[PDB]
Write a protein that binds this ligand. Structure first.
Ligand SMILES: OC[C@H]1O[C@@H](O[C@H]2[C@H](O)[C@@H](O)[C@@H](O)O[C@@H]2CO)[C@H](O)[C@@H](O)[C@H]1O
Ligand SMILES: [Cl-]
Ligand SMILES: [Hg+2]
Ligand SMILES: [Hg+2]
Ligand SMILES: [Hg+2]
Ligand SMILES: [Hg+2]
Ligand SMILES: [Hg+2]
Length: 265
């Protein structure tokens, strides 16, 4: 049951005026591709707040990677789902090394040493899975929430499918031939409902175990399998490279109005 939105004043959408004329904003299976300018964050914030949405953000910080936690968490506090309920899950081998970061109200952090994944189902509505050696530089909000989403890898968004670095050996479960494929998604940023995210990770785990039993390891490991999964189970939203960038390596192209989540130099 979705409650009614309140009266809101905002620019009327124009039917005969395309959103963005420089990029594809919807996939062939009718999934929005999220770019700046395609969404009114005020309307979306209302919709999700009225649902008392809770977002779980998971990160794995092992060994030297624990050093990236402070900047990651501090910037997430400034740009990630601000205004909504957020639960951070930090999986690490050094629980005592997790920095004490000051959190805004309605936000919490759980340190799990490497639990019952069934806990996710009762604690959050959506799960966002990212790499820790990153920092938020701009808004990353509810516009990304949907049953299942993948993010366009910043190095291949303009590449043809034959150039995608998919696993090309038919002996692997992550195999994708040259005439197949929509996009090349990066394994560093994906998510969706708890149910869909667990289905994806469960599928990846089983496929990788099958490859190991067969004596093969996909070219890009988990990412190869992520791409195979998203090819056969189309994501309900696709995030543009605005959500996963590396300015040192790729600069700042005009097509990117905002650089929201970037690699740390
Ligand atoms: O091809 C998948 C891997 O891409 C790596 O990024 C590379 C990119 O592939 C290459 O074409 C060039 O742009 O340099 C990039 C940075 O080394 C990722 O680092 C790796 O995780 C895979 O996604
Ligand atoms: Cl992840
Ligand atoms: Hg628009
Ligand atoms: Hg369990
Ligand atoms: Hg996750
Ligand atoms: Hg996996
Ligand atoms: Hg995966």
């Amino acid at each position: 049951f979705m409650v009614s939105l309140p009266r809101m004043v905002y620019p009327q959408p124009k039917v005969l005026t395309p959103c963005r004329k420089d990029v594809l904003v919807v996939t062939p299976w009718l999934a929005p591709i999220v770019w700046e300018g395609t969404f009114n964050i005020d309307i979306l914030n209302e919709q999700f707040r009225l649902q008392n949405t809770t977002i779980g953000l998971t990160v794995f910080a092992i060994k030297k990677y624990v050093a990236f936690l402070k900047l990651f968490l501090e910037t997430a506090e400034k740009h990630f789902m601000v205004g909504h309920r957020v639960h951070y899950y930090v999986f690490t081998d050094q629980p005592a090394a997790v920095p004490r970061v000051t959190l805004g109200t309605g936000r919490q952090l759980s340190v799990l040493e490497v639990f019952c994944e069934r806990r996710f189902l009762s604690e959050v509505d959506y799960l966002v899975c990212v790499d820790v050696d990153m920092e938020f530089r701009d808004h990353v909000g509810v516009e990304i929430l949907t049953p299942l989403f993948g993010t366009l890898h910043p190095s291949f968004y303009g590449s043809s499918r034959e150039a995608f670095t998919y696993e090309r050996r038919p002996q692997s479960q992550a195999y994708i031939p040259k005439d197949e494929g929509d996009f090349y998604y990066m394994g560093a940023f994906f998510g969706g409902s708890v149910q869909e995210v667990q289905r994806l990770t469960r599928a990846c785990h089983q496929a990788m175990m099958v490859d190991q039993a067969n004596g093969i390891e996909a070219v890009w490991h988990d990412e190869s399998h992520l791409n195979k999964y998203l090819l056969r189970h189309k994501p309900t939203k696709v995030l543009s490279p605005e959500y996963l960038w590396d300015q040192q390596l790729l600069g700042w192209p005009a097509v990117l109005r905002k650089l929201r989540f970037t690699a740390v130099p």
